[PDB]
Amino acid sequence: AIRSNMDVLTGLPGRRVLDESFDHQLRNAEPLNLYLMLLDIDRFKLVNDTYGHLIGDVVLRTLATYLASWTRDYETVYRYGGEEFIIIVKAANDEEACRAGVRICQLVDNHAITHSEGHINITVTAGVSRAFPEEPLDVVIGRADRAMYEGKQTGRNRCMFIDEQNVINRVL
Numbered sequence: 001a002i003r004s005n006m007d008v009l010t011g012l013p014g015r016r017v018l019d020e021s022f023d024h025q026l027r028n029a030e031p032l033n034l035y036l037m038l039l040d041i042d043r044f045k046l047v048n049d050t051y052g053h054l055i056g057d058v059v060l061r062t063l064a065t066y067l068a069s070w071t072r073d074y075e076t077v078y079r080y081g082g083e084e085f086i087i088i089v090k091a092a093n094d095e096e097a098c099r100a101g102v103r104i105c106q107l108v109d110n111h112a113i114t115h116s117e118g119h120i121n122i123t124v125t126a127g128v129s130r131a132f133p134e135e136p137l138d139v140v141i142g143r144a145d146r147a148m149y150e151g152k153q154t155g156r157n158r159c160m161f162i163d164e165q166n167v168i169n170r171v172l
């Protein structure tokens with residue numbers, strides 16, 4: 001069968017589910033603020049080159065399961081790209097959204113991925129942005145992407161926030 005609302009590998013909803021639902025989610029976030037958390041597996045190409053793509057698939061499937069287990073039910077985890085996940089967070093303020101982001105980064109770092117021949121330690125870099133009313137998804141992801149990139153530049157295994165001045169800081 002063809003199930004366009006599910007990533008076959010991880011079982012998570014994919015890009016199309018977020019793209020199609022984002023405007024609705026943002027409209028109905030009130031009275032809360034909506035935040036977008038973009039997560040990329042650190043040096044994932046290297047994992048595949050070292051262990052092979054079958055093991056890479058285990059990493060993706062396991063991380064998906066982990067993220068699902070580490071998030072609240074109304075905050076959906078998507079597999080947005082090949083090595084990229086998105087979590088849509090609703091929160092009262094920036095500090096709460098950033099706490100969600102940094103705790104998820106910390107959990108990833110602290111839970112090895114079991115595979116047949118041992119264990120692999122992975123980390124993620126995360127960028128978080130507020131979605132302002134009526135903004136399209138590409139703008140929100142664009143800003144989170146800037147935050148995430150600065151995270152990769154400054155050491156990886158961390159969560160970054162881009163604020164209302166479009167200035168990026170690491171979340172501690």
Ligand SMILES: Nc1nc2c(ncn2[C@@H]2O[C@@H]3COP(=O)(O)O[C@H]4[C@@H](O)[C@H](n5cnc6c(=O)[nH]c(N)nc65)O[C@@H]4COP(=O)(O)O[C@H]3[C@H]2O)c(=O)[nH]1
Pocket residue numbers: 069070071072073103
């Ligand atoms: N550190 C931290 N982690 C958070 C927070 N919100 C969600 N999580 C994480 O997301 C997982 C799933 O949350 P849930 O579906 O709401 O499902 C939760 C929730 O229904 C409940 N629960 C656990 N602790 C609390 C709590 O302190 N307050 C409330 N109201 N419920 C809790 O038990 C379920 C399973 O909890 P966990 O195994 O801990 O698993 C939690 C935890 O890993 C948070 O604010 N801080």
Ligand SMILES: Nc1nc2c(ncn2[C@@H]2O[C@@H]3COP(=O)(O)O[C@H]4[C@@H](O)[C@H](n5cnc6c(=O)[nH]c(N)nc65)O[C@@H]4COP(=O)(O)O[C@H]3[C@H]2O)c(=O)[nH]1
Pocket residue numbers: 071072075089090091095096097099100103
């Ligand atoms: N929307 C959203 N907000 C998040 C998430 N994670 C953290 N926050 C926000 O950050 C506040 C502090 O989280 P914390 O330091 O983990 O501090 C948390 C944590 O120690 C615990 N807690 C709450 N829920 C859970 C849970 O489901 N599992 C576990 N293990 N602890 C929880 O209670 C403390 C207070 O929780 P809150 O009053 O809810 O207050 C939370 C909440 O407003 C998230 O995944 N989604």
Ligand SMILES: [Mg+2]
Pocket residue numbers: 071072073
């Ligand atoms: Mg749950």
